[PDB]
Amino acid sequence: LEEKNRMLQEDPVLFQLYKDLVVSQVISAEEFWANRLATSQDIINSFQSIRQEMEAYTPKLTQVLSSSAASSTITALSPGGALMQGGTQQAINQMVPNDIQSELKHLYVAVGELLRHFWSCFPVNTPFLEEKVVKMKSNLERFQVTKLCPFQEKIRRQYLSTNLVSHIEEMLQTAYNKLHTWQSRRLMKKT
Amino acid sequence: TKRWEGGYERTWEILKEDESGSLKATIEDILFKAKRKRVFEHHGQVRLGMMRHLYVVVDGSRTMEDQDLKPNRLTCTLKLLEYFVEEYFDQNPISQIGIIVTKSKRAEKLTELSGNPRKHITSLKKAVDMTCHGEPSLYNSLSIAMQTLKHMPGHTSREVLIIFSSLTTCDPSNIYDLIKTLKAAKIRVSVIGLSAEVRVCTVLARETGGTYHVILDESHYKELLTHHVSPPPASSSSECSLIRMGFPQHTIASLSDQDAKPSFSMAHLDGNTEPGLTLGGYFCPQCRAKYCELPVECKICGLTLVSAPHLARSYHHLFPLDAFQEIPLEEYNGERFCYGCQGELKDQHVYVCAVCQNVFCVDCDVFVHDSLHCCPGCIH
Amino acid sequence: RAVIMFGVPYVYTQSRILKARLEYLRDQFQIRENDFLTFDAMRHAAQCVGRAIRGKTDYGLMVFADKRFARGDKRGKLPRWIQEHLTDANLNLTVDEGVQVAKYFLRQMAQPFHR
Amino acid sequence: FTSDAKDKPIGCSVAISTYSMLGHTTKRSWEAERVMEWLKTQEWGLMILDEVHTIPAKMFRRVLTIVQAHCKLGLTATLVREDDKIVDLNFLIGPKLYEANWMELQNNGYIAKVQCAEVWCPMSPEFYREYVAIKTKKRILLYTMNPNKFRACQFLIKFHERRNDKIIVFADNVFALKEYAIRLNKPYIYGPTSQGERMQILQNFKHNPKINTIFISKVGDTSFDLPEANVLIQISSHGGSRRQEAQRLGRVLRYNAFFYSLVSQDTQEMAYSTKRQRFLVDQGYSFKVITKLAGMEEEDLAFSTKEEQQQLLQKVLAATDL
Amino acid sequence: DELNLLVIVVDANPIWWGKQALKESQFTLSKCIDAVMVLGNSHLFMNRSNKLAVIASHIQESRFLYDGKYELLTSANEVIVEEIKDLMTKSDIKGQHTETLLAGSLAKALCYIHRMNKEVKDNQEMKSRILVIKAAEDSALQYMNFMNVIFAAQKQNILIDACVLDSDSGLLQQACDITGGLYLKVPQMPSLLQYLLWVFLPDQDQRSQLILPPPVHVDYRAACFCHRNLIEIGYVCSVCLSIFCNFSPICTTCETAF
Amino acid sequence: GTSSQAEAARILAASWPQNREDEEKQKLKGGPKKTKREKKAAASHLFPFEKL
Ligand SMILES: [Zn+2]
Ligand SMILES: [Zn+2]
Ligand SMILES: [Zn+2]
Ligand SMILES: [Zn+2]
Ligand SMILES: [Zn+2]
């Protein structure tokens, strides 16, 4: 107990993570410190058609460009246009206040650690690891429900335009899909 | 007898005249002979390589405070080590570098064995303001290097480089037993001393198969490092050696699309300052982890992220371009336009590829053999 | 690699044995007492300093820590194979310059040579 | 055979000696007399002469006639000489056999590509009045001790020491060199100092990072064993000796290196430098003119104020050698 | 003394242009050729010493295409029109090959630039850039040759600009990123000439002054030796650095090397 | 003296070959640099103490 307490005190970030994972019932303290220690002849027909069309070729001047086309191209290339999109998270350094940013970084670190444990468990070569991956998935789901859902609610309340949760969802969805695919393979191997 | 005590050389007898003006043909021949001064190979040395896990051991004793190399040994050594790391990572795509510093009869692993160039350079720059105290310990440094490299795969060439400034080393135990263990571990050890020759370093280099050298000046130091840059020759086929590595595409994000997803970089998350939450970067093909630098092994799934052009840049050595057959212009009964540059063929010799039987002038042949490394006709 | 001579090694004049031989050489072979003492001292110094070079590939450093060696009467007693390498530049140099010379010599002697 | 060790020159294969001893016009030493008598009684094969440029002298020529030899091979680096006595050397020894092309020699990289410089300094007003006032040969010290040239030399010395470059400073008129070297507290060779002191100074000059700059007074105008140097700064050299400047340039080569020449404007030194560089330009070297020194006022230099500059006038006029 | 060389590579794949003509769209191959000619004329107008070269890539081979208007432009346009007419009229489909021989045209362009560089007087530097307009789909069978061409261009410091019309090409993106060139996808095909004059017409030094669209998301997917297909994760040999899609007990390339 | 430093610097630094070079510099350098290679040539022909 005394030895365990001093480790948390030296790293408050880990202490905050320890509370966010153990007190919130996401993971057990036993598992917490365990890890720490082409087509048909129509193509030839089209080729012949274009050959005949370009057989009688004459240069043109007016048809090459028009005032409307040039204006549209300039508008597209003007600052703030489609190709010149000037927003690109205008003030993301000051958007989504740093109080949320610190929480986002903590969530990123926690998700990275959990996924690192999951991928270290992968590939599953022994039946012992099968339960461990299921426990990791359960811990991931509990952490998501505990933190990301309030995080999403806070983001929606403040109406932040950045899709910060989207990347976290992408990694979690990828991990879930990989686990489901591996389980499907495991079922197929037993057939 | 002597070569210079015989007859005086008359080099001007080469030129001759038969039509009172044929010297133009002779000078044209001289100009033609002036070209093709290369062996049609940019390197001409080792045509292959092997993955190297190189460990650099740096002395941190009081002898590094000596001012033999301005301003002192430590600063010049660190600068040349930064240059060596840059060049080594440039010429070795999938190699790894670890750094160990010996001080006060102990060894500290300054940087983990990895392929990131920026991390090593940052650590070296941080180490400039270290404190030089105590005496070096070769035994501890070699023990740490062996322990780290003991579990490495056999196909990789395990190499250890020691920069030994002090002439004295404190060994807690016998060192020759450690040398025998290293020999059994097939670990190559090379030492570049600074002051003078030391018996133990020479014995270690001889037994481990490495090379021992002594620095004369900064230029000699740089030459020795450059010599150490080159990879060792590799056998034709050793084992089933392969590696699972990904090729992360550099997908940036734009706010024009609805998939503009900011993400903090894994490398930047460990920094004290606010990590760069850029629009996009390099996404891991396996776990979609975001990284800014390459080549960097993935922190999450352990996959190796490498850039395909870096690997492909050395592919021309595997399939070198055959030398074209030199044929005089008169004897070639065909087109008189170069197939590569469309220029008129006026030189006395025309080069014809053995595969596509095209025509290339001297300049185009040199360009193909030196830079292009591929025959334009064979591509078609 | 280095052989240091801390002063000219002079045999003890006591025991009344050296002096008898000196007198015998003086009155029989007309040998100066100081000359014979210097000869014996330099012979012993050279004998104990010349054992650092055994073999063509072998190399070493030889230093004499005494100003008395600087005089010609004692340098001339050194063997000829060492005289030519004892340049007049380093005959009375201080400790720091001697250390610098030793550093340069050892640095330049470590390079490979052929047979 | 130089009357220093007398290593039994009688009965020898190769004998090495020097001039001014084979042509003694006075009584000779008994051992030296016997050695000369032995040496004048047999033929010599390939009599080798070093520094052949100063062969046509009053006493050096008869040295050729005082000994008998079959082949006389002369070697030199600076064949240029005044008094047009080089023509006599054509029949004294033989014809000019080989003349190395210095440009292509340094293009191969085996000779240091020395960047020659000719940078002048303006004459301070406190000195120019006295320079134009005096004409009875007392103006040699005046442009020699120009405060502006002193500042330029100090700036060059400090700049090249900050980058760890070996410097050799040539300076004739040893009287000026005294206060030129003691001001910076740097080693100098007066020239009649001793044999040991010069040898040890030159020996510790190369293998010492603490000290890397020395001053030479016309002593380095011959073939010595001076170590490798990258910077040469000559001040107040001889009148028009192209040989001296060529030799001094030869002490640097062995832009790996570069040498500077400091002269005073509106003085005879301008004409002297112009007329003594015509040999090196024929050799292919070009002297870039430097009129401004970067960062002259960046740091503090000697003679910063006018007080010490005008105080220098009394001590430079204190010679009064009459 | 600033010499600018512009080499324009035109994707003349008959299949893609035939499909475009069948679509009866507002953009045709004739308009593309006219836009290329106008761009070349503008490049020649930019400076007296500017040199122009035009190469058209086809399924067969690479063809060197090079009253009130400029005389030299009149001669240049007529030669290009004659060459493109000769290439298209004599273009006969003989075989199953459909991918454009883009790599060979780039190699010919590099050889031509190397030839022109020597003819330049030593007092002047010939800054050379290559502009490629892409119409057909990218070809993965020529990955190695394309990478070799990119490396040669980078070694000789030659800019490579890609103008993708319909389908994005990863190889062109890699070439633009490595050589420092500009990669742009045309939103509206009829406005192609305006894009070419607005973006690719200025030289690199002028590009520093001007504001240009940021580079697109360049991919770096590698090509497997035994499949020649883009892959994200693959096995790479530690000796010859060859890339394989699936694990093998013995390296095929290292087996070849004895 | 404080003024002695300034007076000596003014006299020495611009005595003969600056009172006309500074005037030409002030009356010139109106147009931009023709090419970047001139700076390279200047750096190659300049001595190391003129580069800082
Ligand atoms: Zn990953
Ligand atoms: Zn050609
Ligand atoms: Zn071919
Ligand atoms: Zn495959
Ligand atoms: Zn292989």
Judged by a CB distance cut-off of 8 A, whether residue B68 touches chain D is yes
Residues B341, D237: Cα–Cα separation, whole Å: 61
Collect all residues of chain B within an 8 Å Cβ-Cβ radius of residue D161: none
Q: Which of D145, D220, D152, D207 is nearest to D179 (CA)?
A: D145
Kindly give the pairing relationship between strand B157-163 and strand B188-193.
parallel
CB atoms within 10 A of CB B80: 19
Spacing of C-alpha B107 from chain mean position: 27
- Give burial (CB, 10 Å; 0-12/13-18/19+) of F51: exposed
What's the token pair of residue D145? 């001790």
Residues E241, E31: Cα–Cα separation, whole Å: 45
Residues D184, D205: Cα–Cα separation, whole Å: 16
Residues D57, F14: Cα–Cα separation, whole Å: 48
Collect all residues of chain D within an 8 Å Cβ-Cβ radius of residue B68: 209
Q: Which ligand is closest in space to the CA of residue B358?
A: 3
**Torsion of the alpha carbons at B174, B180, B186 and B187, rounded to the nearest 10:** 20
Query: Do A43 and E18 make contact, defined as CB atoms within 8 angstroms?
Result: yes
Judged by a CB distance cut-off of 8 A, whether residue D209 touches chain C is no
Residues of B with CB under 8 A from a CB of C: 193, 195-197, 214-216
Residues B74, B65: Cα–Cα separation, whole Å: 7
Give one DSSP letter per residue of E26-50, joined into a string.
Answer: S--HHHHHHHHHHHHHHHHHH-TT-
Structural contact between residues A143 and A95, judged by C-beta atoms closer than 8 angstroms: no
**D75 CB contacts (<8 Å, ≥6 apart)?**
D48, D49, D50, D51, D52
Which residues on neighbouring strands pair with residue E56, listed in sequence order?
A: E10, E63
Pairs of CB atoms within 8 A across E/F = 3
Residues E53, E105: Cα–Cα separation, whole Å: 12
Pairs of CB atoms within 8 A across D/F = 53
Count the helices and strands in chain C (H runs, E runs): 5, 2
The C-alpha of D22 sits at a distance from chain C's nearest C-alpha, in angstroms, of 25
With contact defined as 3+ CB pairs under 8 Å, the chains touching A are B, E
Which residues on neighbouring strands pair with residue D213, listed in sequence order?
A: D167
Cis amide leading into B295 (omega within 30): yes
Query: Do B196 and C111 make contact, defined as CB atoms within 8 angstroms?
Result: no
Residues E97, D87: Cα–Cα separation, whole Å: 84
**Torsion of the alpha carbons at B232, B237, B243 and B249, rounded to the nearest 10:** 80
Query: Do E111 and B341 make contact, defined as CB atoms within 8 angstroms?
Result: yes
Across the interface, of D196, D204, D208, the residue whose CB is closest to C92 is D196
The nearest alpha carbon in chain B to C103 belongs to B195
Structural contact between residues D285 and D248, judged by C-beta atoms closer than 8 angstroms: no
Q: Which of A125, E107, A89, C108 is nearest to B280 (CA)?
A: A89
Documented resolution in Å: 3.6
Q: How far is the centre of ligand 1, averaged over its atoms, from the C-alpha of E215 (Å)?
A: 25
**B250 CB contacts (<8 Å, ≥6 apart)?**
B280, B281, B282, E177, E217, E218, E219, E220
Residue E243 main-chain phi, psi, to 5 deg: -110, 135
Which residues on neighbouring strands pair with residue B160, listed in sequence order?
A: B55, B189
Residues D316, D314: Cα–Cα separation, whole Å: 6
The C-alpha of D294 sits at a distance from chain F's nearest C-alpha, in angstroms, of 5
With residue C106 as reference, give the H or E element that holds it.
helix C95-109
CB atoms within 10 A of CB D163: 11
- Half-sphere exposure at residue E244, Cβ-oriented, CA atoms within 13 angstroms: 20
Q: How far is the centre of ligand 5, averaged over its atoms, from the C-alpha of C15 (Å)?
A: 84
Residues 264-293 of chain D with CB under 8 A from chain F are: 265-266, 288, 290-293
Spacing of C-alpha B156 from chain mean position: 16
What's the token pair of residue B181? 């263990």
Query: Do B262 and A92 make contact, defined as CB atoms within 8 angstroms?
Result: yes
Give one DSSP letter per residue of B160-216, joined into a string.
Answer: EEEE--SS----SS-HHHHHHHHHHTT-EEEEEESSS--HHHHHHHHHHT--EEE--
Collect all residues of chain B within an 8 Å Cβ-Cβ radius of residue D164: 70
Residues E172, E184: Cα–Cα separation, whole Å: 10
Q: Which ligand is closest in space to the CA of residue E256?
A: 5
Q: Is D151 annotated as a binding residue?
A: no
First-to-final CA distance of chain C: 21
Cis amide leading into D125 (omega within 30): no
Residues A89, B278: Cα–Cα separation, whole Å: 9
Spacing of C-alpha A74 from chain mean position: 35
The nearest alpha carbon in chain D to F22 belongs to D292
Structural contact between residues D129 and D103, judged by C-beta atoms closer than 8 angstroms: no
Residues B302, B283: Cα–Cα separation, whole Å: 14
Residues D94, A140: Cα–Cα separation, whole Å: 100
**A37 CB contacts (<8 Å, ≥6 apart)?**
none
- Give burial (CB, 10 Å; 0-12/13-18/19+) of B97: buried
The C-alpha of B260 sits at a distance from chain A's nearest C-alpha, in angstroms, of 7
Query: Do C103 and D203 make contact, defined as CB atoms within 8 angstroms?
Result: no
Residues A75, E191: Cα–Cα separation, whole Å: 12
By the CB criterion, residues less than 5 angstroms from ion ligand 2 are B 338, 340-341, 361, 364
At B59 the three-state DSSP class reads strand
Judged by a CB distance cut-off of 8 A, whether residue A60 touches chain E is yes
Structural contact between residues A92 and B277, judged by C-beta atoms closer than 8 angstroms: yes
First-to-final CA distance of chain F: 29
- Cα torsion angle, C64, C70, C74, C78, sign: positive
With residue C97 as reference, give the H or E element that holds it.
helix C95-109
Task: Please state whether B288 falls in left (phi above 0), alpha (psi between -120 and 50) or beta.
Answer: left
Kindly give the pairing relationship between strand E62-64 and strand E125-134.
unpaired
Residues A75, A69: Cα–Cα separation, whole Å: 10
Q: How far is the centre of ligand 5, averaged over its atoms, from the C-alpha of E247 (Å)?
A: 12
Query: Do C97 and D196 make contact, defined as CB atoms within 8 angstroms?
Result: no
**D87 CB contacts (<8 Å, ≥6 apart)?**
none
**Torsion of the alpha carbons at D59, D61, D65 and D69, rounded to the nearest 10:** 130
> For residue D66, what are the CA distances in angstroms to D15, D22, D43, D70?
16, 8, 12, 13
Q: Which of E192, E181, E164, E165 is nearest to E38 (CA)?
A: E192
Place of tokens 């300093």: C49
Judged by a CB distance cut-off of 8 A, whether residue B219 touches chain D is no
Structural contact between residues E188 and E165, judged by C-beta atoms closer than 8 angstroms: no
Residues B113, E206: Cα–Cα separation, whole Å: 44
Residues D25, D39: Cα–Cα separation, whole Å: 17
> Which technique was used to obtain these atomic coordinates?
cryo-EM
Collect all residues of chain D within an 8 Å Cβ-Cβ radius of residue F16: 122, 265-266
- Give burial (CB, 10 Å; 0-12/13-18/19+) of B333: exposed
Across the interface, of D147, D291, D294, the residue whose CB is closest to F17 is D291
Q: Is D251 annotated as a binding residue?
A: yes
Place of tokens 């495991």: A186
Judged by a CB distance cut-off of 8 A, whether residue E125 touches chain F is yes
Structural contact between residues D102 and D246, judged by C-beta atoms closer than 8 angstroms: no
Residues B112, B53: Cα–Cα separation, whole Å: 11
Structural contact between residues E238 and B243, judged by C-beta atoms closer than 8 angstroms: yes
Residues A155, D140: Cα–Cα separation, whole Å: 89
List, as own/partner pairs, every contact residues A20-29 make where C-beta atoms lie below 8 angstroms and the sequence separation is at least 24, other chains included: A20/A106, A20/A110, A20/A143, A20/A146, A20/A147, A21/A110, A21/A139, A21/A143, A24/A142, A24/A146, A24/A147, A25/A142, A25/A146, A26/A139, A26/A142, A26/A143, A26/A146, A27/A139, A27/A142, A27/A143
Give one DSSP letter per residue of B298-344, joined into a string.
Answer: -TTT-PEE--HHHHHTTHHHHSPPPPPEEEETTT--S--B-TTT--B
With residue B251 as reference, give the H or E element that holds it.
strand B250-251
In what side-by-side order are the strands of the sheet with B106-114?
Answer: B106-114, B96-103, B52-59, B157-163, B188-193, B212-214
Residue D186 main-chain phi, psi, to 5 deg: -130, 150
At D125 the three-state DSSP class reads helix
**C5 CB contacts (<8 Å, ≥6 apart)?**
C45, C48, C49, C62, C63, C64, C65, C66, C69
**D234 CB contacts (<8 Å, ≥6 apart)?**
D169, D170, D171, D245, D248, D259, D260, D261, D262
Query: Do B68 and D164 make contact, defined as CB atoms within 8 angstroms?
Result: no
Q: Which ligand is closest in space to the CA of residue E235?
A: 4
What letter represents residue E90's amino acid?
Answer: K
Residues D226, C1: Cα–Cα separation, whole Å: 29
Query: Do B274 and A101 make contact, defined as CB atoms within 8 angstroms?
Result: yes
What letter represents residue B312's amino acid?
Answer: A
**E48 CB contacts (<8 Å, ≥6 apart)?**
none
Report helix angle E14-22 to A42-55, nearest 10: 90
Which residues on neighbouring strands pair with residue E133, listed in sequence order?
A: E10, E163
Kindly give the pairing relationship between strand D167-171 and strand D231-235.
parallel
Judged by a CB distance cut-off of 8 A, whether residue A73 touches chain E is yes
**Best of D261, D305, D308, D309 to disrupt the F interface by mutation (most F CBs within 10 Å)?**
D305
At A11 the three-state DSSP class reads coil
With residue E223 as reference, give the H or E element that holds it.
strand E222-223
> For residue B309, what are the CA distances in angstroms to B130, B294, B305, B376?
38, 12, 13, 21
Give one DSSP letter per residue of D166-186, joined into a string.
Answer: -EEEEES-HHHHHHHHHTTT-
With residue E222 as reference, give the H or E element that holds it.
strand E222-223
At E18 the three-state DSSP class reads helix
Query: Do A57 and E28 make contact, defined as CB atoms within 8 angstroms?
Result: no
**Best of A90, A94, A104, A115 to disrupt the B interface by mutation (most B CBs within 10 Å)?**
A115
Residues E74, E67: Cα–Cα separation, whole Å: 8
Q: Which of E208, E128, E127, E143 is nearest to E175 (CA)?
A: E143
Collect all residues of chain E within an 8 Å Cβ-Cβ radius of residue F37: 125
Judged by a CB distance cut-off of 8 A, whether residue C107 touches chain B is yes
Across the interface, of B240, B280, B380, the residue whose CB is closest to E101 is B380
Q: Which of B195, B173, B233, B205 is nearest to B49 (CA)?
A: B233
Q: How far is the centre of ligand 5, averaged over its atoms, from the C-alpha of B182 (Å)?
A: 27
The C-alpha of A62 sits at a distance from chain B's nearest C-alpha, in angstroms, of 33
Label residues E170-192 b or e (16+ Cβ within 10 Å = b). Answer: bbbbbbbbbbbbbbbbbeebbbb
Residues D185, C56: Cα–Cα separation, whole Å: 46
Kindly give the pairing relationship between strand E222-223 and strand E230-231.
antiparallel
- Cα torsion angle, D132, D135, D140, D145, sign: negative
Q: Which of D284, D285, D298, D219 is nearest to D258 (CA)?
A: D285
Spacing of C-alpha E227 from chain mean position: 25
Residues D184, D233: Cα–Cα separation, whole Å: 15
With contact defined as 3+ CB pairs under 8 Å, the chains touching E are A, B, F
Structural contact between residues E162 and E11, judged by C-beta atoms closer than 8 angstroms: no
Residues D20, D153: Cα–Cα separation, whole Å: 37
**A144 CB contacts (<8 Å, ≥6 apart)?**
A172
- Give burial (CB, 10 Å; 0-12/13-18/19+) of D13: exposed
Judged by a CB distance cut-off of 8 A, whether residue D59 touches chain C is no
Angle of CA points A90, A96, A97, to nearest 5°: 120
Query: Do D309 and F11 make contact, defined as CB atoms within 8 angstroms?
Result: no
Judged by a CB distance cut-off of 8 A, whether residue D200 touches chain C is yes
Q: Which ligand is closest in space to the CA of residue B377?
A: 3
